[PDB]
JSON list of C-alpha atoms in Angstrom, two decimals:
[
{"chain": "A", "resi": 1, "resn": "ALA", "atom": "CA", "xyz": [42.24, -2.07, 72.96]},
{"chain": "A", "resi": 2, "resn": "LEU", "atom": "CA", "xyz": [45.21, -0.50, 74.77]},
{"chain": "A", "resi": 3, "resn": "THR", "atom": "CA", "xyz": [43.69, 2.97, 74.25]},
{"chain": "A", "resi": 4, "resn": "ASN", "atom": "CA", "xyz": [42.75, 3.35, 77.93]},
{"chain": "A", "resi": 5, "resn": "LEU", "atom": "CA", "xyz": [46.22, 2.72, 79.39]},
{"chain": "A", "resi": 6, "resn": "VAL", "atom": "CA", "xyz": [48.05, 5.06, 76.98]},
{"chain": "A", "resi": 7, "resn": "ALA", "atom": "CA", "xyz": [46.64, 8.19, 78.66]},
{"chain": "A", "resi": 8, "resn": "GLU", "atom": "CA", "xyz": [49.04, 7.71, 81.58]},
{"chain": "A", "resi": 9, "resn": "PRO", "atom": "CA", "xyz": [52.39, 7.88, 79.70]},
{"chain": "A", "resi": 10, "resn": "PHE", "atom": "CA", "xyz": [51.02, 10.63, 77.43]},
{"chain": "A", "resi": 11, "resn": "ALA", "atom": "CA", "xyz": [50.27, 12.78, 80.48]},
{"chain": "A", "resi": 12, "resn": "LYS", "atom": "CA", "xyz": [53.75, 11.92, 81.73]},
{"chain": "A", "resi": 13, "resn": "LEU", "atom": "CA", "xyz": [55.25, 13.29, 78.51]},
{"chain": "A", "resi": 14, "resn": "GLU", "atom": "CA", "xyz": [53.21, 16.49, 78.30]},
{"chain": "A", "resi": 15, "resn": "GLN", "atom": "CA", "xyz": [53.95, 17.25, 81.97]},
{"chain": "A", "resi": 16, "resn": "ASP", "atom": "CA", "xyz": [57.71, 16.90, 81.35]},
{"chain": "A", "resi": 17, "resn": "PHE", "atom": "CA", "xyz": [57.77, 19.69, 78.74]},
{"chain": "A", "resi": 18, "resn": "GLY", "atom": "CA", "xyz": [55.24, 22.13, 80.23]},
{"chain": "A", "resi": 19, "resn": "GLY", "atom": "CA", "xyz": [52.53, 22.57, 77.62]},
{"chain": "A", "resi": 20, "resn": "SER", "atom": "CA", "xyz": [49.90, 20.33, 76.08]},
{"chain": "A", "resi": 21, "resn": "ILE", "atom": "CA", "xyz": [50.24, 17.55, 73.51]},
{"chain": "A", "resi": 22, "resn": "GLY", "atom": "CA", "xyz": [47.61, 16.39, 71.01]},
{"chain": "A", "resi": 23, "resn": "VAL", "atom": "CA", "xyz": [48.03, 13.04, 69.28]},
{"chain": "A", "resi": 24, "resn": "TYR", "atom": "CA", "xyz": [45.84, 11.04, 66.90]},
{"chain": "A", "resi": 25, "resn": "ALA", "atom": "CA", "xyz": [46.61, 7.90, 64.89]},
{"chain": "A", "resi": 26, "resn": "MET", "atom": "CA", "xyz": [44.52, 5.68, 62.63]},
{"chain": "A", "resi": 27, "resn": "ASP", "atom": "CA", "xyz": [44.92, 2.12, 61.39]},
{"chain": "A", "resi": 28, "resn": "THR", "atom": "CA", "xyz": [43.85, 1.61, 57.79]},
{"chain": "A", "resi": 29, "resn": "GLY", "atom": "CA", "xyz": [43.60, -2.18, 58.12]},
{"chain": "A", "resi": 30, "resn": "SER", "atom": "CA", "xyz": [41.40, -2.12, 61.24]},
{"chain": "A", "resi": 31, "resn": "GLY", "atom": "CA", "xyz": [40.51, 1.36, 62.46]},
{"chain": "A", "resi": 32, "resn": "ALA", "atom": "CA", "xyz": [42.33, 1.55, 65.81]},
{"chain": "A", "resi": 33, "resn": "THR", "atom": "CA", "xyz": [42.31, 5.17, 67.00]},
{"chain": "A", "resi": 34, "resn": "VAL", "atom": "CA", "xyz": [44.86, 6.10, 69.66]},
{"chain": "A", "resi": 35, "resn": "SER", "atom": "CA", "xyz": [43.48, 9.50, 70.69]},
{"chain": "A", "resi": 36, "resn": "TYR", "atom": "CA", "xyz": [44.86, 11.98, 73.22]},
{"chain": "A", "resi": 37, "resn": "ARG", "atom": "CA", "xyz": [43.92, 15.68, 73.06]},
{"chain": "A", "resi": 38, "resn": "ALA", "atom": "CA", "xyz": [43.32, 14.99, 69.36]},
{"chain": "A", "resi": 39, "resn": "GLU", "atom": "CA", "xyz": [40.37, 17.42, 69.19]},
{"chain": "A", "resi": 40, "resn": "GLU", "atom": "CA", "xyz": [42.04, 20.55, 70.58]},
{"chain": "A", "resi": 41, "resn": "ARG", "atom": "CA", "xyz": [43.13, 23.79, 68.94]},
{"chain": "A", "resi": 42, "resn": "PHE", "atom": "CA", "xyz": [46.79, 23.51, 67.91]},
{"chain": "A", "resi": 43, "resn": "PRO", "atom": "CA", "xyz": [48.87, 26.04, 65.94]},
{"chain": "A", "resi": 44, "resn": "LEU", "atom": "CA", "xyz": [49.78, 24.74, 62.50]},
{"chain": "A", "resi": 45, "resn": "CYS", "atom": "CA", "xyz": [53.06, 26.71, 62.19]},
{"chain": "A", "resi": 46, "resn": "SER", "atom": "CA", "xyz": [54.76, 25.65, 58.90]},
{"chain": "A", "resi": 47, "resn": "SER", "atom": "CA", "xyz": [52.69, 22.47, 58.49]},
{"chain": "A", "resi": 48, "resn": "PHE", "atom": "CA", "xyz": [50.08, 24.16, 56.27]},
{"chain": "A", "resi": 49, "resn": "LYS", "atom": "CA", "xyz": [52.67, 23.96, 53.47]},
{"chain": "A", "resi": 50, "resn": "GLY", "atom": "CA", "xyz": [51.85, 20.26, 53.17]},
{"chain": "A", "resi": 51, "resn": "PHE", "atom": "CA", "xyz": [48.20, 20.95, 52.38]},
{"chain": "A", "resi": 52, "resn": "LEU", "atom": "CA", "xyz": [49.20, 23.97, 50.27]},
{"chain": "A", "resi": 53, "resn": "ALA", "atom": "CA", "xyz": [50.84, 21.69, 47.71]},
{"chain": "A", "resi": 54, "resn": "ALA", "atom": "CA", "xyz": [47.81, 19.41, 47.98]},
{"chain": "A", "resi": 55, "resn": "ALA", "atom": "CA", "xyz": [45.52, 22.27, 46.98]},
{"chain": "A", "resi": 56, "resn": "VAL", "atom": "CA", "xyz": [47.94, 23.06, 44.15]},
{"chain": "A", "resi": 57, "resn": "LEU", "atom": "CA", "xyz": [47.85, 19.41, 43.09]},
{"chain": "A", "resi": 58, "resn": "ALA", "atom": "CA", "xyz": [44.04, 19.54, 43.03]},
{"chain": "A", "resi": 59, "resn": "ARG", "atom": "CA", "xyz": [44.09, 22.65, 40.83]},
{"chain": "A", "resi": 60, "resn": "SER", "atom": "CA", "xyz": [46.29, 20.96, 38.21]},
{"chain": "A", "resi": 61, "resn": "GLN", "atom": "CA", "xyz": [43.68, 18.24, 37.59]},
{"chain": "A", "resi": 62, "resn": "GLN", "atom": "CA", "xyz": [41.09, 20.53, 35.94]},
{"chain": "A", "resi": 63, "resn": "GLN", "atom": "CA", "xyz": [43.71, 23.14, 34.92]},
{"chain": "A", "resi": 64, "resn": "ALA", "atom": "CA", "xyz": [46.14, 21.22, 32.72]},
{"chain": "A", "resi": 65, "resn": "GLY", "atom": "CA", "xyz": [49.61, 22.70, 32.40]},
{"chain": "A", "resi": 66, "resn": "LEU", "atom": "CA", "xyz": [49.39, 24.40, 35.80]},
{"chain": "A", "resi": 67, "resn": "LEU", "atom": "CA", "xyz": [52.39, 22.69, 37.40]},
{"chain": "A", "resi": 68, "resn": "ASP", "atom": "CA", "xyz": [54.83, 23.53, 34.59]},
{"chain": "A", "resi": 69, "resn": "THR", "atom": "CA", "xyz": [53.86, 27.23, 34.80]},
{"chain": "A", "resi": 70, "resn": "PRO", "atom": "CA", "xyz": [56.95, 29.18, 35.95]},
{"chain": "A", "resi": 71, "resn": "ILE", "atom": "CA", "xyz": [57.18, 32.25, 38.18]},
{"chain": "A", "resi": 72, "resn": "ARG", "atom": "CA", "xyz": [59.83, 34.97, 38.21]},
{"chain": "A", "resi": 73, "resn": "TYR", "atom": "CA", "xyz": [61.02, 36.71, 41.37]},
{"chain": "A", "resi": 74, "resn": "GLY", "atom": "CA", "xyz": [61.67, 40.19, 42.68]},
{"chain": "A", "resi": 75, "resn": "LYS", "atom": "CA", "xyz": [61.78, 41.04, 46.37]},
{"chain": "A", "resi": 76, "resn": "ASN", "atom": "CA", "xyz": [58.21, 41.84, 47.51]},
{"chain": "A", "resi": 77, "resn": "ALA", "atom": "CA", "xyz": [57.83, 38.12, 48.31]},
{"chain": "A", "resi": 78, "resn": "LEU", "atom": "CA", "xyz": [61.35, 37.17, 49.47]},
{"chain": "A", "resi": 79, "resn": "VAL", "atom": "CA", "xyz": [61.26, 36.18, 53.15]},
{"chain": "A", "resi": 80, "resn": "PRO", "atom": "CA", "xyz": [63.58, 34.19, 55.46]},
{"chain": "A", "resi": 81, "resn": "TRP", "atom": "CA", "xyz": [63.91, 30.44, 54.93]},
{"chain": "A", "resi": 82, "resn": "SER", "atom": "CA", "xyz": [64.60, 30.53, 51.20]},
{"chain": "A", "resi": 83, "resn": "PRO", "atom": "CA", "xyz": [66.66, 27.36, 50.58]},
{"chain": "A", "resi": 84, "resn": "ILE", "atom": "CA", "xyz": [65.47, 26.78, 47.01]},
{"chain": "A", "resi": 85, "resn": "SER", "atom": "CA", "xyz": [63.72, 30.10, 46.25]},
{"chain": "A", "resi": 86, "resn": "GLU", "atom": "CA", "xyz": [66.76, 32.39, 46.25]},
{"chain": "A", "resi": 87, "resn": "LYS", "atom": "CA", "xyz": [68.94, 29.51, 45.02]},
{"chain": "A", "resi": 88, "resn": "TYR", "atom": "CA", "xyz": [66.94, 29.62, 41.77]},
{"chain": "A", "resi": 89, "resn": "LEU", "atom": "CA", "xyz": [66.25, 33.37, 41.75]},
{"chain": "A", "resi": 90, "resn": "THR", "atom": "CA", "xyz": [66.24, 35.10, 38.36]},
{"chain": "A", "resi": 91, "resn": "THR", "atom": "CA", "xyz": [66.16, 31.69, 36.63]},
{"chain": "A", "resi": 92, "resn": "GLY", "atom": "CA", "xyz": [62.51, 31.37, 37.68]},
{"chain": "A", "resi": 93, "resn": "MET", "atom": "CA", "xyz": [60.78, 28.33, 39.09]},
{"chain": "A", "resi": 94, "resn": "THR", "atom": "CA", "xyz": [57.74, 26.31, 38.06]},
{"chain": "A", "resi": 95, "resn": "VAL", "atom": "CA", "xyz": [54.67, 25.79, 40.23]},
{"chain": "A", "resi": 96, "resn": "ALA", "atom": "CA", "xyz": [55.52, 22.09, 40.58]},
{"chain": "A", "resi": 97, "resn": "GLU", "atom": "CA", "xyz": [59.05, 22.99, 41.69]},
{"chain": "A", "resi": 98, "resn": "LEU", "atom": "CA", "xyz": [57.53, 25.69, 43.91]},
{"chain": "A", "resi": 99, "resn": "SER", "atom": "CA", "xyz": [55.45, 23.04, 45.69]},
{"chain": "A", "resi": 100, "resn": "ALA", "atom": "CA", "xyz": [58.32, 20.56, 46.05]},
{"chain": "A", "resi": 101, "resn": "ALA", "atom": "CA", "xyz": [60.34, 23.37, 47.66]},
{"chain": "A", "resi": 102, "resn": "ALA", "atom": "CA", "xyz": [57.67, 24.36, 50.21]},
{"chain": "A", "resi": 103, "resn": "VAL", "atom": "CA", "xyz": [57.01, 20.77, 51.37]},
{"chain": "A", "resi": 104, "resn": "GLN", "atom": "CA", "xyz": [60.42, 19.07, 51.31]},
{"chain": "A", "resi": 105, "resn": "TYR", "atom": "CA", "xyz": [62.21, 22.15, 52.68]},
{"chain": "A", "resi": 106, "resn": "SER", "atom": "CA", "xyz": [59.47, 24.26, 54.34]},
{"chain": "A", "resi": 107, "resn": "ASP", "atom": "CA", "xyz": [60.37, 27.13, 52.01]},
{"chain": "A", "resi": 108, "resn": "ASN", "atom": "CA", "xyz": [58.62, 30.21, 53.40]},
{"chain": "A", "resi": 109, "resn": "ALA", "atom": "CA", "xyz": [59.11, 32.17, 50.16]},
{"chain": "A", "resi": 110, "resn": "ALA", "atom": "CA", "xyz": [57.67, 29.55, 47.80]},
{"chain": "A", "resi": 111, "resn": "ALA", "atom": "CA", "xyz": [54.67, 29.14, 50.10]},
{"chain": "A", "resi": 112, "resn": "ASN", "atom": "CA", "xyz": [53.83, 32.83, 49.67]},
{"chain": "A", "resi": 113, "resn": "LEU", "atom": "CA", "xyz": [53.70, 32.44, 45.89]},
{"chain": "A", "resi": 114, "resn": "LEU", "atom": "CA", "xyz": [51.49, 29.35, 45.85]},
{"chain": "A", "resi": 115, "resn": "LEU", "atom": "CA", "xyz": [49.16, 31.17, 48.25]},
{"chain": "A", "resi": 116, "resn": "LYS", "atom": "CA", "xyz": [48.71, 33.98, 45.71]},
{"chain": "A", "resi": 117, "resn": "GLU", "atom": "CA", "xyz": [47.79, 31.62, 42.86]},
{"chain": "A", "resi": 118, "resn": "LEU", "atom": "CA", "xyz": [45.22, 29.98, 45.18]},
{"chain": "A", "resi": 119, "resn": "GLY", "atom": "CA", "xyz": [43.33, 33.17, 46.08]},
{"chain": "A", "resi": 120, "resn": "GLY", "atom": "CA", "xyz": [45.26, 33.96, 49.25]},
{"chain": "A", "resi": 121, "resn": "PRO", "atom": "CA", "xyz": [45.18, 32.27, 52.66]},
{"chain": "A", "resi": 122, "resn": "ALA", "atom": "CA", "xyz": [41.44, 31.62, 52.37]},
{"chain": "A", "resi": 123, "resn": "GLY", "atom": "CA", "xyz": [42.12, 29.71, 49.15]},
{"chain": "A", "resi": 124, "resn": "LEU", "atom": "CA", "xyz": [43.67, 26.96, 51.26]},
{"chain": "A", "resi": 125, "resn": "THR", "atom": "CA", "xyz": [40.62, 27.05, 53.54]},
{"chain": "A", "resi": 126, "resn": "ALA", "atom": "CA", "xyz": [38.39, 26.44, 50.51]},
{"chain": "A", "resi": 127, "resn": "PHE", "atom": "CA", "xyz": [40.38, 23.34, 49.55]},
{"chain": "A", "resi": 128, "resn": "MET", "atom": "CA", "xyz": [40.24, 21.84, 53.05]},
{"chain": "A", "resi": 129, "resn": "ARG", "atom": "CA", "xyz": [36.48, 22.45, 53.21]},
{"chain": "A", "resi": 130, "resn": "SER", "atom": "CA", "xyz": [36.15, 20.85, 49.77]},
{"chain": "A", "resi": 131, "resn": "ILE", "atom": "CA", "xyz": [37.51, 17.49, 50.97]},
{"chain": "A", "resi": 132, "resn": "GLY", "atom": "CA", "xyz": [35.79, 17.43, 54.35]},
{"chain": "A", "resi": 133, "resn": "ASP", "atom": "CA", "xyz": [38.01, 19.25, 56.85]},
{"chain": "A", "resi": 134, "resn": "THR", "atom": "CA", "xyz": [35.69, 21.43, 58.94]},
{"chain": "A", "resi": 135, "resn": "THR", "atom": "CA", "xyz": [38.27, 22.12, 61.68]},
{"chain": "A", "resi": 136, "resn": "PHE", "atom": "CA", "xyz": [40.71, 24.01, 59.44]},
{"chain": "A", "resi": 137, "resn": "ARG", "atom": "CA", "xyz": [40.75, 27.74, 60.19]},
{"chain": "A", "resi": 138, "resn": "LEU", "atom": "CA", "xyz": [42.96, 30.84, 60.08]},
{"chain": "A", "resi": 139, "resn": "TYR", "atom": "CA", "xyz": [46.13, 28.44, 61.09]},
{"chain": "A", "resi": 140, "resn": "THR", "atom": "CA", "xyz": [44.53, 25.94, 63.48]},
{"chain": "A", "resi": 141, "resn": "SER", "atom": "CA", "xyz": [43.32, 22.35, 63.18]},
{"chain": "A", "resi": 142, "resn": "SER", "atom": "CA", "xyz": [42.86, 19.37, 65.42]},
{"chain": "A", "resi": 143, "resn": "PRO", "atom": "CA", "xyz": [45.35, 16.47, 65.36]},
{"chain": "A", "resi": 144, "resn": "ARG", "atom": "CA", "xyz": [42.43, 14.25, 64.33]},
{"chain": "A", "resi": 145, "resn": "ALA", "atom": "CA", "xyz": [41.39, 16.58, 61.51]},
{"chain": "A", "resi": 146, "resn": "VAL", "atom": "CA", "xyz": [44.98, 16.63, 60.25]},
{"chain": "A", "resi": 147, "resn": "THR", "atom": "CA", "xyz": [44.92, 12.82, 60.25]},
{"chain": "A", "resi": 148, "resn": "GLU", "atom": "CA", "xyz": [41.71, 12.33, 58.27]},
{"chain": "A", "resi": 149, "resn": "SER", "atom": "CA", "xyz": [42.62, 15.11, 55.84]},
{"chain": "A", "resi": 150, "resn": "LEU", "atom": "CA", "xyz": [46.07, 13.63, 55.18]},
{"chain": "A", "resi": 151, "resn": "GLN", "atom": "CA", "xyz": [44.43, 10.20, 54.93]},
{"chain": "A", "resi": 152, "resn": "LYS", "atom": "CA", "xyz": [42.14, 11.30, 52.09]},
{"chain": "A", "resi": 153, "resn": "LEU", "atom": "CA", "xyz": [44.85, 13.07, 50.08]},
{"chain": "A", "resi": 154, "resn": "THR", "atom": "CA", "xyz": [47.65, 10.48, 50.31]},
{"chain": "A", "resi": 155, "resn": "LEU", "atom": "CA", "xyz": [45.70, 7.24, 50.86]},
{"chain": "A", "resi": 156, "resn": "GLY", "atom": "CA", "xyz": [41.99, 7.81, 50.22]},
{"chain": "A", "resi": 157, "resn": "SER", "atom": "CA", "xyz": [40.35, 8.75, 46.94]},
{"chain": "A", "resi": 158, "resn": "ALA", "atom": "CA", "xyz": [40.57, 12.55, 47.16]},
{"chain": "A", "resi": 159, "resn": "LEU", "atom": "CA", "xyz": [43.49, 13.39, 44.85]},
{"chain": "A", "resi": 160, "resn": "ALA", "atom": "CA", "xyz": [43.66, 11.66, 41.48]},
{"chain": "A", "resi": 161, "resn": "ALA", "atom": "CA", "xyz": [46.14, 8.83, 40.95]},
{"chain": "A", "resi": 162, "resn": "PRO", "atom": "CA", "xyz": [48.83, 11.12, 39.41]},
{"chain": "A", "resi": 163, "resn": "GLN", "atom": "CA", "xyz": [48.44, 13.93, 41.95]},
{"chain": "A", "resi": 164, "resn": "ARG", "atom": "CA", "xyz": [47.87, 11.61, 44.93]},
{"chain": "A", "resi": 165, "resn": "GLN", "atom": "CA", "xyz": [51.05, 9.58, 44.43]},
{"chain": "A", "resi": 166, "resn": "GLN", "atom": "CA", "xyz": [52.90, 12.81, 43.62]},
{"chain": "A", "resi": 167, "resn": "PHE", "atom": "CA", "xyz": [51.78, 14.10, 47.03]},
{"chain": "A", "resi": 168, "resn": "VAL", "atom": "CA", "xyz": [53.07, 10.88, 48.61]},
{"chain": "A", "resi": 169, "resn": "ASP", "atom": "CA", "xyz": [56.43, 11.24, 46.85]},
{"chain": "A", "resi": 170, "resn": "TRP", "atom": "CA", "xyz": [56.57, 14.87, 48.03]},
{"chain": "A", "resi": 171, "resn": "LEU", "atom": "CA", "xyz": [56.12, 13.86, 51.68]},
{"chain": "A", "resi": 172, "resn": "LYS", "atom": "CA", "xyz": [58.56, 10.95, 51.35]},
{"chain": "A", "resi": 173, "resn": "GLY", "atom": "CA", "xyz": [61.24, 13.46, 50.35]},
{"chain": "A", "resi": 174, "resn": "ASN", "atom": "CA", "xyz": [60.71, 15.90, 53.22]},
{"chain": "A", "resi": 175, "resn": "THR", "atom": "CA", "xyz": [63.97, 16.56, 55.06]},
{"chain": "A", "resi": 176, "resn": "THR", "atom": "CA", "xyz": [63.16, 18.74, 58.09]},
{"chain": "A", "resi": 177, "resn": "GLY", "atom": "CA", "xyz": [61.41, 15.94, 59.98]},
{"chain": "A", "resi": 178, "resn": "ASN", "atom": "CA", "xyz": [63.96, 13.24, 60.76]},
{"chain": "A", "resi": 179, "resn": "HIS", "atom": "CA", "xyz": [64.35, 14.11, 64.47]},
{"chain": "A", "resi": 180, "resn": "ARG", "atom": "CA", "xyz": [60.58, 13.62, 64.96]},
{"chain": "A", "resi": 181, "resn": "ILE", "atom": "CA", "xyz": [58.28, 10.89, 63.61]},
{"chain": "A", "resi": 182, "resn": "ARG", "atom": "CA", "xyz": [60.92, 9.61, 61.17]},
{"chain": "A", "resi": 183, "resn": "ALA", "atom": "CA", "xyz": [63.25, 8.63, 64.03]},
{"chain": "A", "resi": 184, "resn": "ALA", "atom": "CA", "xyz": [60.41, 6.88, 65.91]},
{"chain": "A", "resi": 185, "resn": "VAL", "atom": "CA", "xyz": [59.99, 4.13, 63.28]},
{"chain": "A", "resi": 186, "resn": "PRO", "atom": "CA", "xyz": [62.03, 1.17, 62.03]},
{"chain": "A", "resi": 187, "resn": "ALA", "atom": "CA", "xyz": [64.39, 2.49, 59.38]},
{"chain": "A", "resi": 188, "resn": "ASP", "atom": "CA", "xyz": [63.08, -0.07, 56.87]},
{"chain": "A", "resi": 189, "resn": "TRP", "atom": "CA", "xyz": [59.61, 1.53, 57.05]},
{"chain": "A", "resi": 190, "resn": "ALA", "atom": "CA", "xyz": [58.74, 4.13, 54.42]},
{"chain": "A", "resi": 191, "resn": "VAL", "atom": "CA", "xyz": [57.72, 7.47, 55.97]},
{"chain": "A", "resi": 192, "resn": "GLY", "atom": "CA", "xyz": [56.34, 10.70, 54.56]},
{"chain": "A", "resi": 193, "resn": "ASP", "atom": "CA", "xyz": [55.95, 13.63, 56.95]},
{"chain": "A", "resi": 194, "resn": "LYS", "atom": "CA", "xyz": [55.57, 17.40, 57.20]},
{"chain": "A", "resi": 195, "resn": "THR", "atom": "CA", "xyz": [56.88, 19.53, 60.06]},
{"chain": "A", "resi": 196, "resn": "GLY", "atom": "CA", "xyz": [55.90, 22.72, 61.84]},
{"chain": "A", "resi": 197, "resn": "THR", "atom": "CA", "xyz": [58.60, 25.14, 63.03]},
{"chain": "A", "resi": 198, "resn": "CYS", "atom": "CA", "xyz": [57.41, 28.19, 64.97]},
{"chain": "A", "resi": 199, "resn": "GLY", "atom": "CA", "xyz": [59.38, 26.29, 70.62]},
{"chain": "A", "resi": 200, "resn": "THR", "atom": "CA", "xyz": [55.91, 25.01, 69.79]},
{"chain": "A", "resi": 201, "resn": "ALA", "atom": "CA", "xyz": [56.10, 22.38, 67.05]},
{"chain": "A", "resi": 202, "resn": "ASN", "atom": "CA", "xyz": [54.22, 19.50, 65.45]},
{"chain": "A", "resi": 203, "resn": "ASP", "atom": "CA", "xyz": [54.47, 16.81, 62.78]},
{"chain": "A", "resi": 204, "resn": "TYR", "atom": "CA", "xyz": [52.03, 14.65, 60.80]},
{"chain": "A", "resi": 205, "resn": "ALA", "atom": "CA", "xyz": [53.14, 11.61, 58.83]},
{"chain": "A", "resi": 206, "resn": "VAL", "atom": "CA", "xyz": [52.15, 8.46, 56.98]},
{"chain": "A", "resi": 207, "resn": "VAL", "atom": "CA", "xyz": [54.14, 5.35, 57.91]},
{"chain": "A", "resi": 208, "resn": "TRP", "atom": "CA", "xyz": [54.48, 2.30, 55.65]},
{"chain": "A", "resi": 209, "resn": "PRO", "atom": "CA", "xyz": [55.44, -0.82, 57.64]},
{"chain": "A", "resi": 210, "resn": "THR", "atom": "CA", "xyz": [57.13, -3.61, 55.71]},
{"chain": "A", "resi": 211, "resn": "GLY", "atom": "CA", "xyz": [54.28, -5.64, 54.25]},
{"chain": "A", "resi": 212, "resn": "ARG", "atom": "CA", "xyz": [51.57, -4.13, 56.46]},
{"chain": "A", "resi": 213, "resn": "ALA", "atom": "CA", "xyz": [48.80, -1.57, 56.20]},
{"chain": "A", "resi": 214, "resn": "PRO", "atom": "CA", "xyz": [49.93, 2.08, 56.37]},
{"chain": "A", "resi": 215, "resn": "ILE", "atom": "CA", "xyz": [49.25, 4.37, 59.32]},
{"chain": "A", "resi": 216, "resn": "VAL", "atom": "CA", "xyz": [48.42, 8.08, 59.43]},
{"chain": "A", "resi": 217, "resn": "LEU", "atom": "CA", "xyz": [49.02, 10.09, 62.59]},
{"chain": "A", "resi": 218, "resn": "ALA", "atom": "CA", "xyz": [49.55, 13.61, 63.91]},
{"chain": "A", "resi": 219, "resn": "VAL", "atom": "CA", "xyz": [51.53, 14.83, 66.94]},
{"chain": "A", "resi": 220, "resn": "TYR", "atom": "CA", "xyz": [50.89, 18.44, 67.98]},
{"chain": "A", "resi": 221, "resn": "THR", "atom": "CA", "xyz": [52.48, 20.35, 70.87]},
{"chain": "A", "resi": 222, "resn": "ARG", "atom": "CA", "xyz": [52.71, 23.87, 72.29]},
{"chain": "A", "resi": 223, "resn": "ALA", "atom": "CA", "xyz": [55.03, 25.17, 75.02]},
{"chain": "A", "resi": 224, "resn": "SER", "atom": "CA", "xyz": [60.89, 19.70, 71.45]},
{"chain": "A", "resi": 225, "resn": "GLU", "atom": "CA", "xyz": [61.87, 17.43, 68.56]},
{"chain": "A", "resi": 226, "resn": "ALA", "atom": "CA", "xyz": [62.50, 14.39, 70.77]},
{"chain": "A", "resi": 227, "resn": "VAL", "atom": "CA", "xyz": [59.16, 15.07, 72.48]},
{"chain": "A", "resi": 228, "resn": "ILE", "atom": "CA", "xyz": [57.23, 14.56, 69.23]},
{"chain": "A", "resi": 229, "resn": "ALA", "atom": "CA", "xyz": [59.27, 11.45, 68.46]},
{"chain": "A", "resi": 230, "resn": "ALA", "atom": "CA", "xyz": [58.53, 10.05, 71.92]},
{"chain": "A", "resi": 231, "resn": "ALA", "atom": "CA", "xyz": [54.82, 10.87, 71.59]},
{"chain": "A", "resi": 232, "resn": "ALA", "atom": "CA", "xyz": [54.86, 9.07, 68.24]},
{"chain": "A", "resi": 233, "resn": "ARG", "atom": "CA", "xyz": [56.24, 5.89, 69.82]},
{"chain": "A", "resi": 234, "resn": "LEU", "atom": "CA", "xyz": [53.42, 6.05, 72.38]},
{"chain": "A", "resi": 235, "resn": "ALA", "atom": "CA", "xyz": [50.73, 6.29, 69.70]},
{"chain": "A", "resi": 236, "resn": "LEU", "atom": "CA", "xyz": [52.38, 3.64, 67.51]},
{"chain": "A", "resi": 237, "resn": "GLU", "atom": "CA", "xyz": [52.74, 1.10, 70.33]},
{"chain": "A", "resi": 238, "resn": "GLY", "atom": "CA", "xyz": [49.37, 2.14, 71.77]},
{"chain": "A", "resi": 239, "resn": "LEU", "atom": "CA", "xyz": [47.61, 0.47, 68.83]},
{"chain": "A", "resi": 240, "resn": "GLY", "atom": "CA", "xyz": [47.06, -2.99, 70.30]}
]
């Protein structure tokens, strides 16, 4: 149990960038929890878009045909960061494609649309309460709560086999988070992550070591990409 001697280098890291750093990790094959400020309030930034597609995936189970439903655009929902939204403007875009755009590219326009067809911002709160997350609020959560929530959706039995593995394949394809937890792992390890761009940043991921049990973790900061990567290495090695 190296969880007592990891608090020293973590405090070294968070005192070299100014603000605070919250980190939680969990071992599926044992249960080792490397915790450090993992139960503090941390801004979610653009990381809610990972759970937004998860709520959308849960809707499509008892609402067949939901993901192939397309949406047309105008301009009352067009906002900055529109990599795939404005690229497929008048051609429309399905809900499934709308979710793959908001996760794998942090599309701020596609996230606004999926929020509407969920009941608004509180619609995402209802989904997180439905699985067990009691720390989710309007957007704050603890690095531990982000870990258990992501654990249930991608690994645990919370999303059905089609929608669960679809969620995993949606995180595996995320592009904005290579300079963070993706860089802090052996390249041969499969990784699926979601980032948060606000300065203050964060990243939660699931790591698949070659022939070993997978690991869920969350690194949250507030004042920075190499800082999250470094904090990831600390939590990964900290699991004795």
